[PDB]
Motif scaffolding. Structure first.
Motif, PDB file in Angstrom:
ATOM      1  N   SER A  65       0.814  -1.296   0.028  1.00 43.81           N
ATOM      2  CA  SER A  65      -0.038  -0.021  -0.110  1.00 43.81           C
ATOM      3  C   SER A  65       1.044   1.289   0.058  1.00 43.81           C
ATOM      4  O   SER A  65       1.963   1.115  -0.294  1.00 43.81           O
ATOM      5  N   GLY A  66       0.259   2.453   0.277  1.00 47.97           N
ATOM      6  CA  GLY A  66       1.013   3.598   0.275  1.00 47.97           C
ATOM      7  C   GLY A  66       1.715   3.597  -0.902  1.00 47.97           C
ATOM      8  O   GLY A  66       1.703   3.390  -1.906  1.00 47.97           O
ATOM      9  N   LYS A  67       3.088   4.599  -0.442  1.00 43.94           N
ATOM     10  CA  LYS A  67       4.042   4.845  -1.175  1.00 43.94           C
ATOM     11  C   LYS A  67       5.193   3.861  -1.042  1.00 43.94           C
ATOM     12  O   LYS A  67       6.459   3.976  -1.477  1.00 43.94           O
ATOM     13  N   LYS A  68       4.974   2.701  -0.342  1.00 40.61           N
ATOM     14  CA  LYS A  68       5.926   1.895   0.017  1.00 40.61           C
ATOM     15  C   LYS A  68       7.031   1.342  -1.305  1.00 40.61           C
ATOM     16  O   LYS A  68       8.235   1.647  -1.115  1.00 40.61           O
ATOM     17  N   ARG A  69       6.383   1.164  -2.214  1.00 36.81           N
ATOM     18  CA  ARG A  69       6.821   0.608  -3.459  1.00 36.81           C
ATOM     19  C   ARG A  69       7.991   1.244  -3.804  1.00 36.81           C
ATOM     20  O   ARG A  69       8.859   0.753  -4.597  1.00 36.81           O
ATOM     21  N   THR A  70       8.344   2.472  -3.454  1.00 35.19           N
ATOM     22  CA  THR A  70       9.421   3.289  -3.484  1.00 35.19           C
ATOM     23  C   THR A  70      10.274   3.575  -2.261  1.00 35.19           C
ATOM     24  O   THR A  70      11.203   4.038  -2.034  1.00 35.19           O
ATOM     25  N   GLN A  71       9.529   3.310  -1.167  1.00 31.34           N
ATOM     26  CA  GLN A  71      10.225   3.898   0.173  1.00 31.34           C
ATOM     27  C   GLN A  71      10.753   2.611   0.860  1.00 31.34           C
ATOM     28  O   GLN A  71      12.074   2.692   1.282  1.00 31.34           O
ATOM     29  N   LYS A  72      10.054   1.448   1.151  1.00 29.94           N
ATOM     30  CA  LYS A  72      10.616   0.530   2.025  1.00 29.94           C
ATOM     31  C   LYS A  72      12.071  -0.070   1.362  1.00 29.94           C
ATOM     32  O   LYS A  72      12.057  -0.208   0.058  1.00 29.94           O
ATOM     33  N   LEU A  73      12.890  -0.221   2.185  1.00 32.30           N
ATOM     34  CA  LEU A  73      14.400  -0.509   1.553  1.00 32.30           C
ATOM     35  C   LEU A  73      14.964  -1.695   2.390  1.00 32.30           C
ATOM     36  O   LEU A  73      14.612  -1.625   3.624  1.00 32.30           O
ATOM     37  N   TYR A  74      15.261  -2.627   1.703  1.00 31.08           N
ATOM     38  CA  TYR A  74      15.885  -3.831   2.335  1.00 31.08           C
ATOM     39  C   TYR A  74      17.421  -3.698   2.459  1.00 31.08           C
ATOM     40  O   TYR A  74      17.930  -3.260   1.536  1.00 31.08           O
ATOM     41  N   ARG A  75      17.841  -3.589   3.693  1.00 29.67           N
ATOM     42  CA  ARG A  75      19.282  -3.370   3.947  1.00 29.67           C
ATOM     43  C   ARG A  75      20.316  -4.575   4.207  1.00 29.67           C
ATOM     44  O   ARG A  75      19.729  -5.234   5.306  1.00 29.67           O
ATOM     45  N   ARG A  76      21.373  -5.035   3.398  1.00 22.77           N
ATOM     46  CA  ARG A  76      22.101  -6.042   3.913  1.00 22.77           C
ATOM     47  C   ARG A  76      23.189  -5.334   4.258  1.00 22.77           C
ATOM     48  O   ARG A  76      23.481  -4.754   3.279  1.00 22.77           O
ATOM     49  N   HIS A  77      23.939  -5.410   5.417  1.00 25.40           N
ATOM     50  CA  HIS A  77      24.962  -5.052   5.622  1.00 25.40           C
ATOM     51  C   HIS A  77      26.308  -5.954   5.736  1.00 25.40           C
ATOM     52  O   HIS A  77      26.204  -7.017   6.409  1.00 25.40           O
ATOM     53  N   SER A  78      27.292  -5.568   4.807  1.00 26.00           N
ATOM     54  CA  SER A  78      28.507  -6.366   4.979  1.00 26.00           C
ATOM     55  C   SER A  78      28.904  -6.115   6.481  1.00 26.00           C
ATOM     56  O   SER A  78      28.848  -5.269   6.892  1.00 26.00           O
ATOM     57  N   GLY A  79      29.845  -7.168   6.887  1.00 29.19           N
ATOM     58  CA  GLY A  79      30.491  -7.286   8.398  1.00 29.19           C
ATOM     59  C   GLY A  79      31.286  -6.070   8.474  1.00 29.19           C
ATOM     60  O   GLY A  79      31.668  -5.415   9.610  1.00 29.19           O
ATOM     61  N   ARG A  80      32.119  -5.665   7.265  1.00 26.70           N
ATOM     62  CA  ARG A  80      32.850  -4.321   7.364  1.00 26.70           C
ATOM     63  C   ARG A  80      32.463  -3.037   7.298  1.00 26.70           C
ATOM     64  O   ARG A  80      31.375  -2.830   7.074  1.00 26.70           O
ATOM     65  N   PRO A  81      33.041  -1.973   7.768  1.00 24.44           N
ATOM     66  CA  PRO A  81      32.490  -1.091   7.794  1.00 24.44           C
ATOM     67  C   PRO A  81      32.201  -0.270   6.059  1.00 24.44           C
ATOM     68  O   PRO A  81      32.918  -0.601   5.329  1.00 24.44           O
ATOM     69  N   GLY A  82      31.149   0.597   6.280  1.00 27.00           N
ATOM     70  CA  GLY A  82      30.851   1.053   4.652  1.00 27.00           C
ATOM     71  C   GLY A  82      29.950   0.004   4.138  1.00 27.00           C
ATOM     72  O   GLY A  82      29.740   0.247   2.969  1.00 27.00           O
ATOM     73  N   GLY A  83      29.944  -1.155   4.677  1.00 25.19           N
ATOM     74  CA  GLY A  83      29.120  -2.007   3.846  1.00 25.19           C
ATOM     75  C   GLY A  83      27.556  -1.885   3.827  1.00 25.19           C
ATOM     76  O   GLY A  83      26.866  -2.898   3.321  1.00 25.19           O
ATOM     77  N   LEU A  84      27.015  -0.865   4.492  1.00 20.59           N
ATOM     78  CA  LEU A  84      25.591  -0.761   4.661  1.00 20.59           C
ATOM     79  C   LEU A  84      24.835  -0.741   2.967  1.00 20.59           C
ATOM     80  O   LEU A  84      25.553   0.102   2.162  1.00 20.59           O
ATOM     81  N   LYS A  85      23.834  -1.268   2.735  1.00 22.22           N
ATOM     82  CA  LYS A  85      23.272  -1.150   1.532  1.00 22.22           C
ATOM     83  C   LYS A  85      21.913  -1.000   1.393  1.00 22.22           C
ATOM     84  O   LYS A  85      20.887  -2.007   1.251  1.00 22.22           O
ATOM     85  N   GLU A  86      21.628   0.338   1.291  1.00 18.87           N
ATOM     86  CA  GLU A  86      20.400   0.791   0.850  1.00 18.87           C
ATOM     87  C   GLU A  86      19.975  -0.026  -0.116  1.00 18.87           C
ATOM     88  O   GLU A  86      20.691  -0.227  -1.268  1.00 18.87           O
ATOM     89  N   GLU A  87      18.447  -0.248  -0.288  1.00 19.27           N
ATOM     90  CA  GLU A  87      17.957  -0.840  -1.469  1.00 19.27           C
ATOM     91  C   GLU A  87      16.463  -0.915  -1.351  1.00 19.27           C
ATOM     92  O   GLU A  87      15.923  -1.317  -0.379  1.00 19.27           O
ATOM     93  N   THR A  88      15.938  -0.422  -2.550  1.00 22.02           N
ATOM     94  CA  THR A  88      14.358  -0.293  -2.148  1.00 22.02           C
ATOM     95  C   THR A  88      13.640  -1.200  -2.759  1.00 22.02           C
ATOM     96  O   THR A  88      14.093  -1.806  -3.804  1.00 22.02           O
ATOM     97  N   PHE A  89      12.422  -1.358  -2.382  1.00 21.66           N
ATOM     98  CA  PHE A  89      11.638  -2.542  -2.664  1.00 21.66           C
ATOM     99  C   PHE A  89      11.256  -2.795  -4.179  1.00 21.66           C
ATOM    100  O   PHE A  89      11.044  -3.648  -4.776  1.00 21.66           O
ATOM    101  N   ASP A  90      11.395  -1.540  -4.672  1.00 23.16           N
ATOM    102  CA  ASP A  90      11.018  -1.418  -6.508  1.00 23.16           C
ATOM    103  C   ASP A  90      12.325  -2.223  -7.081  1.00 23.16           C
ATOM    104  O   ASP A  90      12.190  -2.992  -7.910  1.00 23.16           O
TER     105      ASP A  90
END
Length: 147
Positions: A65-90
């Motif tokens: 619903s809503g504006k999710k389809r561009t808002q919700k983000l699945y983030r997988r973070h590598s163990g090392r610093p800087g590994g955060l991975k912003e990733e949107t549901f679309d």
RNA sequence: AAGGUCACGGCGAGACGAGCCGUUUAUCAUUACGAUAGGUGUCAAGUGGAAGUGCAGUGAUGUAUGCAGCUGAGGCAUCCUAACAGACCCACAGACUUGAAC
């Protein structure tokens, strides 16, 4: 006297199917993971795996619903610093679709040794046909007026 | 059993396990595969004129024989030496469900 305890159940577990073509993600995933646990069985028991396999099909067309389809983000973070991975549901639903539902239930159901073991009871497919005719999967009952 | 491992000969591989290539009638023959390490034979390459004898010098020393002589973990050739003997792990059809075709 003594409450009954889930005594050995191997296979012949019911296979269900859910065509997720435009069925909103959360609510569906709650009624998936309630048939993944077995809380629809007088034989229910948290410590044993009385559940039932299910099969999601059309895993590309789950609605949110809503504006999710561009808002919700699945983030997988590598163990090392800087590994955060912003990733949107679309981007996922475009790129790898089954991981969507593979998250939804994987949060719903009880992580642990047992939860980890059961999560195999969810077979997710992005096509429109599922290769399982195992128990001739009977379509899945939805007690949710809002989907 | 297929495959391995060990052993044996070693490496542009390696702290040790790893890796990788050998393991002999190590072909023979009408255009590629069966030289692994050494030794040997030869060639690149290096250094640079050997030893002995002769000549010139009173003597240091030079000069000729002479890109010779010692080098030769690189290149090919060579079974001369060593890969001999072995040993060990590895198995028998891959439980249970329905589905489908003949």
């Amino acid at each position: 006297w003594y409450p009954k305890s889930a005594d050995h159940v191997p296979t012949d577990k019911k296979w269900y199917v859910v065509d997720a073509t435009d069925l909103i993600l959360g609510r569906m995933a709650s009624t998936i993971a309630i048939h993944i646990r077995g809380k629809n069985l007088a034989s229910y028991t948290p410590s044993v795996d009385m559940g039932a396999f299910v099969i999601v099909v059309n895993a590309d067309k789950v609605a949110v619903s809503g504006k999710k389809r561009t808002q919700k983000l699945y983030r997988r973070h590598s163990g090392r610093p800087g590994g955060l991975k912003e990733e949107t549901f679309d981007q996922l639903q475009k790129r790898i679709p089954e991981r969507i539902i593979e998250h939804a239930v994987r949060g719903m159901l009880p992580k642990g040794r047992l939860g980890r073991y059961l999560f195999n009871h969810l077979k997710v497919y992005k096509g429109a046909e599922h290769p399982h005719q195992a128990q001739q999967p009977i379509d899945l009952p939805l007690r949710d007026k809002r989907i």
